[PDB]
Ligand binder design. Structure first.
Ligand code: NAG
Ligand code: JEG
Lengths: 180, 136, 325, 142, 51
């Protein structure tokens, strides 16, 4: 998917699905925004109820593409690596804790949130809860892998060696026989 | 491909190995090992000598593996050589940020009263960028 | 000391109602004045040149070595059988023949060894070709991981741990510098020498040499990553920044237009204008691409070979223990 | 994350990849496991929970958490006359007061923003798309 | 003959005979060998580059 604006999205297909959750805030982006208002409807089709099912469809390969905010998605991207995230985060936004305007405790909360940002508390928490263990940019870095791939050549050479054994047997019988 | 810092060190360790081998032989020769290092490195195969000893044999095998690795370095660097094009020098699209990020230092030139100028003046959407085109 | 400075003063003196700019956000200023929600992802970050610090060894894919063992088994068996210390020699020759020939001694007369040698030779050309091609491929297609991978590695924490003097600096009177002084003292007290007059001049310290790394706001460092006279400068890692923050806007206190502003802000992204404005103002031409003379990783493998030579000394010692037996 | 408390016993001593024991708290929320949907006592542990307790040590407050009945966070809906009902989901609980404060991964937007105050963002992220990587690129012949 | 050996050494070795004894020949052989390895690397790399 080339971009947030993907001609492939722009060129929708019944054959190529693009899936989301109805009532997810993304849907609010689609409804509220006039400029893309046409594009909303194609997404509206074949919506999923929850996050797990939405990831699963792509995993199950029921749906070719899935659209959701990165913070929930990237962690999963690390979790499988069978699946990948693509393009540039659009609808760039942030996640925050809700409170009524009337409640003053939020004044401290933000004040606290910032204090938690400066020390790198968040960085270490994302570092803990985002595993990052196994995945990479797929296109260009096959080279780390390839043991199996070489094996696919080497096994053949070795089979050549097994031939070496049969040939040797033939030579051994035939030679002693030859000069007997 | 190989920095002179890389290059000299590889030779220094080259001798430093052939000698460790030679020294190994002499202790328990100079021409033998020096020419052995260079021969083993270059696949010259003078064939004058080889050490029987396990230390020497292992050092030599690892040495040859390292020869393969160095020829690989020549190849990697040649491959680095093959990327003919630098990241710059392109005007990416009809709308280019280098235009969008104008500079007194980086000129973008056109002819005033050329129909292009009419495109710049008549069109509102790019009208800001027009000034960068309009100047000079 | 006791007193504030800058636009915030004019916000406090009521000479400014709201202050706008590249201003970062922090707890103190949020305490004194209400801030708008962040419109852009930014923060502290690093900008450095492409110094890389055995990815060539890695194309083995842990297979070349395993292959070497398997090869050892095959060579040994073949040599022992075929002729119909000397065996070890013959397999030394075969092992040499594996890597670019370059083995001096005595191809065995025995006939089966010749054919096995031919097949093995095909295997050897395969080994050279595969290893070299994969190495060249890594010479292409590389993510180019950089100086501080941990990024908290404390290499920054002390320069003195590293024998050559390291260098990094930032612009003073910044939210970055104040934050630094608050959390990390030693870094501040050390970096005061490396502090620079202006971002163009800070850039002068990075660009012409005489400074290794530069640290500054992430949005500015990313735009500068994108915009450079040559693509000589890049961000740190993915440019994923600690102290994750965004640019806010000043107001006086609890009494203000306040929320009305905030709504407006998210209407701006709400219609998708910010992406367009990002492409026009923020987007740099660089970093589309992602290229240097060989560096330290070859030195690492080189060292590994040296270490293996040490192993030759250890095998010599084991042989010596053996000789008495 | 959601797991039920084992029998009466509360929470697992399970440990993070960096050696630390995982913290956990009790949360009452919707269960689809039973055919009918009971508001079920559960154990929940999270980034937002660690943040919440971090605040709780920092802040004078004490916390009791229950997950919202609706799986959705919230969206405006229902009846036509005047403005009728309210956005379904945890947000709706916030205005209703079912929960006085909302801790979750909630994106921050103006449409919601007029109704309620929003804490400064702990996280910065944007929408994106997930698609499977694997279309490959096997014999020396090739 | 000697130059047959040197020419073989030029292309990927694979020549059997008799590196000349003369001492100077060892050094000349070394320098030429470096030139030859440069030739192999360059040829293979250029081939891949055209690929
Ligand atoms: C920063 O401010 C101090 C005084 O507050 C001043 O002495 C110093 O020169 C300033 N540095 C720059 C680069 O403006
Ligand atoms: N935006 C900055 C601020 O003080 O708000 C200037 C910048 C810096 O010096 O790195 C942070």
């Amino acid at each position: 998917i080339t971009g947030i604006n993907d001609p492939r999205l722009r060129n929708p297909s019944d054959k190529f699905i693009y899936a989301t959750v109805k009532q997810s805030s993304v849907d609010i982006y689609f409804r509220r925004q006039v400029e893309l208002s046409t594009m909303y409807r194609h997404m509206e089709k074949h919506n999923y109820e929850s996050a797990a099912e939405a990831i699963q469809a792509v995993r199950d390969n029921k749906l070719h593409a899935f659209i959701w905010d990165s913070a929930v998605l990237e962690f999963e991207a690390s979790q499988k690596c069978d699946l990948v995230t693509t393009g540039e985060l659009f609808f760039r936004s942030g996640f925050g804790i809700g409170m009524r305007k009337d409640s003053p405790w939020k004044q401290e909360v933000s004040l606290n949130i910032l204090k938690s940002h400066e020390n790198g508390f968040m960085e270490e928490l994302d570092k803990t809860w985002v595993r990052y263990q196994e995945c990479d940019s797929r296109s260009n870095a096959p080279a780390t892998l390839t043991f199996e791939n070489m094996a696919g050549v080497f096994m053949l050479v070795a089979g050549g060696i097994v031939a070496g054994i049969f040939l040797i047997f033939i030579e051994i019988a035939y030679k002693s026989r030859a000069e007997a | 491909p190989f920095q002179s810092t890389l290059w000299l060190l590889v030779g220094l360790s080259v001798h430093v190995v052939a000698v460790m081998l030679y020294l190994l032989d002499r202790f328990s020769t100079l021409s033998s090992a020096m020419w052995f290092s260079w021969r083993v490195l270059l696949n010259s195969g003078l064939g004058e000598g080889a050490p029987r000893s396990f230390s020497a044999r292992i050092l030599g095998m690892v040495w040859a593996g390292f020869a393969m690795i160095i020829v690989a370095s020549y190849t990697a660097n040649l491959a680095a050589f093959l990327v003919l094009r630098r990241p710059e020098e392109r005007i990416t699209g009809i709308n280019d940020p280098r235009l969008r990020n104008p500079s007194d230092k980086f000129i973008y030139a056109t002819v005033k009263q050329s129909s292009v100028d009419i495109y710049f003046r008549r069109q509102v959407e790019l009208s800001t960028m027009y000034r960068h085109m309009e100047k000079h | 000391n006791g007193v504030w400075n800058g636009m915030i003063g004019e916000v406090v003196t009521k000479r400014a109602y709201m202050a706008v700019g590249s201003l970062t956000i922090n707890e103190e200023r949020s305490e004194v004045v209400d801030f708008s929600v962040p419109f852009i992802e930014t923060g502290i970050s690093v900008m450095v040149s492409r110094s890389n610090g055995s990815a060539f060894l890695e194309p083995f894919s842990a297979d070349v070595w395993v292959m070497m063992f398997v090869m050892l088994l095959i060579v040994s068996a073949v040599a022992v059988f075929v002729f119909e210390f000397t065996i070890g020699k013959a397999i030394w020759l075969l092992w040499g023949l594996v890597f670019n020939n370059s083995l001096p001694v005595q191809n065995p007369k025995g006939t089966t060894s010749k054919i096995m040698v031919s097949v093995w030779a095909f295997f050897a050309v395969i080994f050279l070709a595969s290893y070299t091609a994969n190495l060249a491929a890594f010479m292409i297609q590389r993510r180019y991981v950089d100086q501080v991978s941990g990024l908290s590695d404390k290499k920054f924490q002390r320069p003195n741990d590293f024998s050559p003097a390291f260098r990094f600096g930032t612009v003073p009177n910044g939210s970055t510098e104040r934050n630094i002084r608050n959390n990390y003292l030693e870094m501040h007290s050390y970096m005061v020498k490396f502090n620079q007059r202006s971002v163009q001049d800070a850039l002068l310290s990075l660009k012409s040499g005489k400074l290794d790394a530069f640290i500054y706001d992430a949005a500015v460092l990313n735009y500068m990553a994108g915009r450079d006279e040559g693509c000589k400068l890049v961000t740190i890692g993915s440019g994923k920044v600690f102290a994750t923050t965004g640019y806010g806007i000043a107001i006086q206190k609890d009494s203000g237009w306040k929320r009305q502003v905030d709504l407006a802000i998210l209407q701006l992204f709400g219609d998708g204008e910010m992406e367009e404005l990002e492409a026009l103002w923020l987007t740099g031409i660089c970093h589309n691409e992602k290229s240097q003379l060989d560096i330290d990783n070859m030195a690492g493998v080189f060292y590994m070979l040296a270490a293996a030579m040490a192993l030759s000394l250890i095998t010599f010692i084991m042989e010596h223990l053996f000789y008495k037996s | 994350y959601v797991r039920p408390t084992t029998s009466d016993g509360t929470c697992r001593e399970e440990y993070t990849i960096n050696g630390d024991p995982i913290k956990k708290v009790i949360c009452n929320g919707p269960d689809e496991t039973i055919p009918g949907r009971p508001t079920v006592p559960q154990c929940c542990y999270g980034f937002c929970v660690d943040l919440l307790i971090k605040l709780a040590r920092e802040m004078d407050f004490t916390y009791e958490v229950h997950l919202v009945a609706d799986g959705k966070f919230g969206t405006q809906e229902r009846v036509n006359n005047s403005n009728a009902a309210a956005w379904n989901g945890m947000m709706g609980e916030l205005l209703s007061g079912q929960a006085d404060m909302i801790v979750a991964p909630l994106t921050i937007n103006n449409e919601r923003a007029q109704y309620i105050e929003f804490s400064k963002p702990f996280k910065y992220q944007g929408l994106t798309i997930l698609v499977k990587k694997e279309i490959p690129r096997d014999s020396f012949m090739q």
